Symmetry: D3
Subunit: 155 residues, 6 copies
């Protein structure tokens, strides 16, 4: 039984995230999306989880959970030791590499990186929110349910 | 009827910026420098605009305006669809690429990048202010007008 | 009286190149595609030129010429002093920056960089030829005319 | 029935490669090491030598096997009923080229590429730099598995 | 009478920093570790604590001394009759910003900056990531000198 | 007694190289420029050494020697264990980092990197030769004696 964790704040989840989720779910027996919260954003943890579940309805081996603290503890507590992280334009890859090597050192957890599809490579949660805030149309970059909710939080 | 917008916070404008303005003005019929308002910074919007106008008096086809909201709206509301953005040492080019792809997606606006001259490649508004704050000589890196104004804000 | 030169070996021209040509032609009055002759490659200079002309028939202000020697001489001998160069995934941008600074130094020619559309961001002439050689379908990544011609050279 | 292909020329395999093999084998049900051969440029080691050196240093990995191939990697992957590649990263990896290839490979064949950074201890070895250093007498013994080191010295002498 | 300044906030010093200190001390007649303080943002450790942790882990380096400062690094360097900075590189270093600062520092004061990559074993530690990991219970004991680790745990508790 | 080696092929030496030499000579008691030859260029080893000696006449603690084989052997044979390498626009820094870590591992030799001055940041031996070959003026980027010799080898 294989498995990996897909971590992020997902505030909100984007089609870039979904693409990575789909690829993880296709290649591992079990995937857990870890909605990591800070001491703070647009959507509550519960809202974020609901948006991810709506978007991943077709992935029966993927589940969504909230987490706090050390990512490697979240991973190991669930009997796993792999992380799958997406890459997009603007990803701080050098910092991701630093964290991957740190996470392997402190807990033996591996990190696999996968680039999101070119079509979704320039969306990020932060930039989608910024563009939407000023009336820009990011509907092609987000799940339909997310775009609906986003307009709600803004209007 | 060609034209481009050169965006930035310009707090203050540097010779690195001016070099890019000059190239934009040499290659496009019309250039608009967009002083993006959203942090208070050191100089007020009017001061920034004044300093740019003073530094670009020899560029007849260049004008300076402030703007709020999406950069692409600023560009499109003036009948243009090109941005000219400078590169220097320390530019977050990956983030600029993300924004360029987003801006093309949401509004059909092209972004052209040009590297500033080597002599001005290590100045930024932030680093110039920091160095000058602590008594370093940045007079070779700023328009003569700007430099005096900066000393004024500090003393 | 604005103008830019779009240089490359174009062996063959891709949709990534065409996207850049289209943007250059939309933002400058005059565009010259420079097919730089110096390795024999797959297609002859005349074939490359033909394929570009066929692919750019809807761009009235664009023309195609071959060139030898310094790119800056090609540009300056046509009364221009701007280069428009595309960026894709795998572009050696650091080398392009070195050449841009050198070209500005020796001839006062500016270089503007523009990222090609995400959909065409992973095609290159080399990778398209390699993949097609081994039977991969690159028809979505090349002008329809070019694609048939490529199949011809292979079969 | 999960699985991935770990590709390379492995001329010779290094401890950097082996680290990546081990991680892939720990995270996928089956792993195939694809020894990709250019039929028009011989390397230092023959295909059989390359395969033997990998097998001898992966004997502890029961779910890993080693096969050679040529042409499109995605055909090698798909003909084995898989659609994942696991590729290692080290210092000096042309990551932008690997990203270009990954996006191309997804486009033409639907195959996903997962990248994993090799351990810091092995992050500066590559087949090419190991061969170069050894050619001029440098000690690369700590960077290559035992199945490789003296065979490499043999080729050079 | 050669010499270099090794700058940082060292809040706390890591084994990555110490590796760089050791290399600088091996290659220059004198080394000064400059503990640069922002007078308007306190860190986890006080200046005296930072200096004590560095001193305790550099006792074997007779030609290294430790001093705090603020403001322009190049003034700290020049007022000591030196004109070289030795700065470490690790994974996640903002090298482009360091390059910008190096060119600025040469321009305004004639001071040269030499960069050296820390050892692979210490390449993924940083003061900030060590503090973050330790805050949430992760084991960073192998990445920090003995002068630091339990003091860090003390601050966090 | 401190010391470092500055390695390269220097075919020919540029002002970028000279800037690095000067900084090494200012910071180390002894500097050795290692002219490394391959199994191949424009100038012979002896010509390269002569051009470097002409350019470094004012550096009494710097000497020039040819070398073959492992750079770390060259360094250690001379009682040293430091390398000083310059950085310019277009340097393959990731490969330099790989070699530095390899060189430290196999022989305990440290590598210090220093960026050349912005004015000399876009010259390289290869690009200077290429530009000069087609009649471009690189005289501001090379020592006077070198530029003289370069015109000689070309004409
Ligand atoms: C698909 C994807 C991958 C990575 C990131 C990230 O860098 O945090 C993002 C995002 O910024 O929201 N998105
Ligand atoms: C000439 C120039 C080009 C780009 C930038 C930028 O990254 O915003 C700057 C700056 O930081 O002030 N300056
Ligand atoms: C669209 C595009 C932009 C740039 C390049 C290049 O790096 O030369 C290429 C290509 O490799 O064919 N293509
Ligand atoms: C461990 C490892 C990962 C990737 C590579 C590569 O860039 O091909 C190598 C190598 O070059 O031999 N090695
Ligand atoms: C060894 C080392 C070198 C450089 C840095 C840095 O980027 O400031 C660090 C750190 O962040 O603590 N550490
Ligand atoms: C000053 C300098 C530093 C490094 C290099 C290099 O990368 O080889 C060069 C060059 O290319 O000739 N020049």
């Amino acid at each position: 039984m294989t498995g990996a964790v897909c971590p992020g704040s997902f505030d909100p989840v984007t089609l870039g995230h979904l693409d990575v989720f789909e690829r993880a779910a296709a290649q591992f027996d079990e995937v857990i999306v870890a909605v990591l919260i800070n001491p703070a954003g647009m959507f509550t943890v519960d809202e974020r989880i609901e948006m991810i579940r709506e978007s991943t309805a077709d992935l029966p081996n993927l589940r969504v959970e909230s987490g706090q603290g050390l990512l490697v503890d979240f991973v190991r507590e669930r009997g796993l030791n792999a992380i799958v992280k997406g890459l997009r334009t603007g990803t701080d890859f050098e910092y991701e590499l630093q964290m991957a090597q740190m996470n392997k050192h402190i807990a033996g957890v591996d990190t696999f990186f996968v680039a999101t599809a070119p079509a979704y490579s320039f969306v990020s949660s932060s930039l989608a929110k910024e563009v939407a805030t000023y009336g820009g149309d990011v509907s092609a970059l987000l799940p339909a349910s997310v775009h609906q909710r986003l307009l709600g939080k803004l209007r």
